[PDB]
């Protein structure tokens, strides 16, 4: 529904994030017009977040637990599961579909 996932490279197929876990992710975020609005890869800084607890947009909270540890995937996120009608000024317009390349590098202490 609000997020769908295309697998690019498989993870270990065994370890999946659960609600409340902390995950480490490398990502690149783009608009559908091609604009890159952010990239942890470009700043060489893996991004850590608790998953499933609303600290990140819903598309991440729902999509990331579907990935196995080590997986590279692309999340396509509808506005309802992203920043909605307001967007995120100044970088994400209202009603933006978001495209995230995501690599699941760690779950809690597992790498
Ligand atoms: C003072 C606070 C700053 C504080 C910033 C940091 C700790 C730095 C951290 C690395 C954020 C990134 O800095 C390079 C940027 O990430 C993006 O570039 C990105 O790629 C992007 O979309 N994301 C980053 C990677 C994961 C997916 C997604 C995300 O969910 O991000 C969290 C966020 C903005 C949550 C909103 C929470 C509000 C609520 O209304 C909304 O519901 C709809 C959701 C974000 C991790 C938040 O938890 C922490 C912060 N937030 N600023 C807030 C809350 O205003 C977005 C577009 C903008 C972010 O810089 C402003």
Author numbering: 1 to 111
Task: List sentences from the manuscript.
Previous crystal structures of AfFKBP12 bound to FK506 required a Pro90Gly mutation in order to trap the ligand in the binding cavity. Without this mutation, an apo homodimer was captured that is hypothesized to result from a self-catalysis mechanism involving the Pro89-Pro90 motif. Here, we obtained crystals of AfFKBP12 bound to APX879 without the requirement for a P90G mutation by the addition of APX879 during purification. Our AfFKBP12-APX879 crystal structure further emphasizes that the Pro90 cis conformation might modulate the binding cavity volume. In the AfFKBP12-APX879 crystal structure, two protein monomers bound to APX879 were resolved, one showing the acetohydrazine moiety in the same orientation as the FK506-C22 ketone (C21-C22 dihedral angle of 68°) and the other showing a 90° rotation of the acetohydrazine moiety with a C21-C22 dihedral angle of −44°. This suggests conformational flexibility that might be restrained upon calcineurin binding. The affinity for APX879 was reduced by ∼40-fold for hFKBP12 and McFKBP12 (KD, ∼120 nM) and 100-fold for AfFKBP12 (KD = 462 ± 23 nM). The binding stoichiometry for hFKBP12 and McFKBP12 was 1:1, while for AfFKBP12, a stoichiometry of 2:1 (ligand-FKBP12) was obtained for both FK506 and APX879 binding. This could be due to the displacement of a sparsely populated low-affinity homodimer or a shift in the Pro90 cis/trans equilibrium triggered by FK506/APX879 binding. Contrastingly, the Cα-RMSF (atomic positions in the MD simulation fitted to the crystal structures) highlighted areas of the proteins and ligands exhibiting conformational differences. Both fungal FKBP12 proteins when bound to APX879 showed high RMSF deviations for residues 52 to 55 not observed for the hFKBP12-APX879 complex nor for any of the FK506-bound counterparts, suggestive of altered conformational states for these residues.
